[PDB]
């Protein structure tokens, strides 16, 4: 069956919109689950002895909007108090209450689809024996799929995927490749090269497909303890071509960092 909500009711009876349906709608619009909140202190909460007074704070928990207007929560002394919003839909006259607890007891209870009390922590208030020493809010998580944006400013950090690969290129040369965002690669040279000529393909393993560039990449390396250098080409097919001078039977230690992009423009 299909239940339609954001539609006109021709005979004023067809599509009633329930509080739980709006709850789910709001959760979906903002990208929140039952383990996070939306919270805004329009005015600062006030601390008095072992109490926190929410002067004007709006909260969205399980897609349900409510306001804390001069709502005081009594705190435990010498403790880290986890402030929770508790939603019990069976308490029809007062479905929301606040508690100060010894741990983060957020339960992720789906109040829009089933029974139960939703508990969600939104503030952490630390006390001494006499009053509040510090306050830290719980983070508001936005769980999204694909984002198209014009500009972004990050104050903290972006965590992107990382892949690593060690290649025994042949002739004693080793490459340790680290790829981030599936695009930027930094190659670190190791080992010691011998028995190779300029223009020759190295005798070992080719670069795995996920690390292959779209265009040939020339990576400069250095011979440890010498004033001499070399370069290798990582070809789009994964092969590696030696572009240093010819090396005889005696191995020479090869080191250095070289970077390349896997992806070209479009």
């Amino acid at each position: 069956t299909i239940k339609n909500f954001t539609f006109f009711s021709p005979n004023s009876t067809e599509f009633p919109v329930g509080s739980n349906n709006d709850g789910k709608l709001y959760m979906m619009l903002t990208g929140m689950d039952y383990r996070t909140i939306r919270r805004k202190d329009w005015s600062s909460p006030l601390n008095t002895a072992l109490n926190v007074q929410y002067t004007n704070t709006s909260i969205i928990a399980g897609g349900r909007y409510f306001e804390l207007l001069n709502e005081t929560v009594a705190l435990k002394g010498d403790s880290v108090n986890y402030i929770h919003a508790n939603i019990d839909l069976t308490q029809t006259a007062n479905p929301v209450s606040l508690s100060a607890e010894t741990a983060n007891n957020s339960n992720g209870v789906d109040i829009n689809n089933g029974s139960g009390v939703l508990k969600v922590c939104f503030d952490i208030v630390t006390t001494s024996g006499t009053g509040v020493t510090s306050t830290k809010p719980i983070v508001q998580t936005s769980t999204l799929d694909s984002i198209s944006v014009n500009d972004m400013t990050v104050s903290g950090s972006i965590d992107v995927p990382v892949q690593t690969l060690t290649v025994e290129a042949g002739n004693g040369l080793q490459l340790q490749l680290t790829k981030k965002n599936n695009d930027l690669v930094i190659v670190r040279f190791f080992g010691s090269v011998s028995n190779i000529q300029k223009g020759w393909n190295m005798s070992g393993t080719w670069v795995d497909r996920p690390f292959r560039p779209a265009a040939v990449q020339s990576l400069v390396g250095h011979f440890a303890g010498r004033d001499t250098s070399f370069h290798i080409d990582i070809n789009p097919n994964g092969s590696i071509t030696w572009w240093g001078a010819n090396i005889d039977k005696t191995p020479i230690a090869t080191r250095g960092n070289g970077s390349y992009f896997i992806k070209s423009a479009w």
Partner: peptide
């Protein structure tokens, strides 16, 4: 080693604003 002075608007209150009057823009 050298002495440090600071002006607190509310020592031990969560809303405390600290002016470093030794190393800040106001000394």
């Amino acid at each position: 080693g050298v002495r440090q002075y600071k002006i607190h608007t509310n020592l031990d209150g969560t809303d405390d604003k600290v002016w470093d009057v030794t190393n800040g823009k106001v000394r």
